[PDB]
Write an enzyme that holds these catalytic residues in place. Structure first.
Site, PDB file in Angstrom:
ATOM      1  N   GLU A 102       0.809  -1.189   0.000  1.00  0.00           N
ATOM      2  CA  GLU A 102       0.000   0.000   0.000  1.00  0.00           C
ATOM      3  C   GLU A 102       0.851   1.251   0.000  1.00  0.00           C
ATOM      4  OE1 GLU A 102      -3.416  -0.756   3.049  1.00  0.00           O
ATOM      5  OE2 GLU A 102      -4.201  -1.096   0.911  1.00  0.00           O
ATOM      6  N   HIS A 115      -0.064  -5.551   8.035  1.00  0.00           N
ATOM      7  CA  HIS A 115      -0.474  -4.497   8.998  1.00  0.00           C
ATOM      8  C   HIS A 115      -0.928  -5.207  10.313  1.00  0.00           C
ATOM      9  CE1 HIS A 115      -1.609  -1.857   5.369  1.00  0.00           C
ATOM     10  NE2 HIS A 115      -0.325  -1.572   5.688  1.00  0.00           N
ATOM     11  N   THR A 194      -6.665   1.897   5.569  1.00  0.00           N
ATOM     12  CA  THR A 194      -6.603   1.861   4.077  1.00  0.00           C
ATOM     13  C   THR A 194      -7.798   1.244   3.437  1.00  0.00           C
ATOM     14  OG1 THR A 194      -5.286  -0.008   4.134  1.00  0.00           O
ATOM     15  CG2 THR A 194      -4.109   2.093   4.350  1.00  0.00           C
TER      16      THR A 194
HETATM   17 ZN   LIG Z   1      -4.330  -3.110   6.020  1.00  0.00          ZN
END
Ligand SMILES: [Zn+2]
Ligand SMILES: [Hg+2]
Length: 255
Positions: A102, A115, A194
């Site tokens: 990302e 993440h 995100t």
């Molecule tokens: Zn994420």
């Protein structure tokens, strides 16, 4: 919302107006404009007492859930104020090895991004956390194709079990410490989740050093499905959001 053509990130603004907000994530990490801040404390990861409960395919990715009823796997130090509890971890990967992350580094895209989501333990629960500018702390780690990650195999082997949307599986005694790079050198800036609701509550902490995974490790991620059982098969690939405009924000470096 999804990652397809007609429901992709270019559409989320209609359902989630904050899409065009002032502190949206992911962003490009310009390492030359990045500001070496010497007041940045060393990161402090304490996952020795972590407790994994299950793995779930939620339709946009798979999440490894943790017991956040006590300070078992917490995050503190660095740019943070107070203790942040691990509630889950997930990935973002591409259809090919040339895309997937990302966050980008000097426009460079990685194969995938991990993440680790933590929430501020003075807000009591996660649902409250997401109502504060400093409510969450996401620890970002970049994944590159190279040698296999031993510590990631356990995850890799269970994906068969959750191929489609809504499937879950018991997933205890998973030690997260094996997904960490050698160095805790990071970059930090004020952003958001995100993925929808896109709440602007995150303190991002993207580590400099990437972890390497094998081709076959990543290949198993791409076998997943967005779709739920008995529907036409939509392979779980490119579940990433394009970098957003920094819009005045400043990216600080611990190195
Ligand atoms: Zn994420
Ligand atoms: Hg918030």
């Amino acid at each position: 919302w999804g990652y397809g053509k007609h429901n992709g990130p270019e559409h989320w603004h209609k359902d989630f107006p904050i899409a065009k907000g002032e502190r949206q994530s992911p962003v490009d990490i310009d390492t030359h404009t990045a500001k070496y801040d010497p007041s940045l404390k060393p990161l402090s990861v304490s996952y020795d007492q972590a407790t994994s409960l299950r793995i779930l395919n939620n339709g946009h990715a798979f999440n490894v859930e943790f017991d956040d009823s006590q300070d078992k796997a917490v995050l503190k130090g660095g740019p943070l104020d107070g203790t942040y509890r691990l509630i889950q971890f997930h990935f973002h990967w591409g259809s090919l090895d040339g895309q997937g992350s990302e966050h980008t580094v000097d426009k460079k895209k990685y194969a995938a991004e991990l993440h680790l989501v933590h929430w501020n333990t003075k807000y009591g629960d996660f649902g409250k956390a997401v109502q504060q500018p400093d409510g969450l702390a996401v620890l970002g780690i970049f994944l590159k194709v190279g040698s296999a990650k031993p510590g990631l195999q356990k995850v890799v082997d269970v994906l068969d079990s959750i191929k489609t949307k809504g499937k879950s599986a018991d997933f205890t005694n998973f030690d997260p410490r094996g997904l960490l790079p050698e160095s805790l050198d990071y970059w930090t800036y004020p952003g958001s989740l995100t993925t929808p609701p896109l709440l602007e509550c995150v303190t991002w902490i993207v580590l400099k050093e990437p972890i390497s995974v094998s081709s076959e490790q990543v290949l198993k991620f791409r076998k997943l499905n967005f779709n739920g059982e008995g529907e036409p098969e939509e392979l779980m690939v490119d579940n990433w959001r394009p970098a957003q405009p920094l819009k005045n924000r400043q990216i600080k470096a611990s190195f």
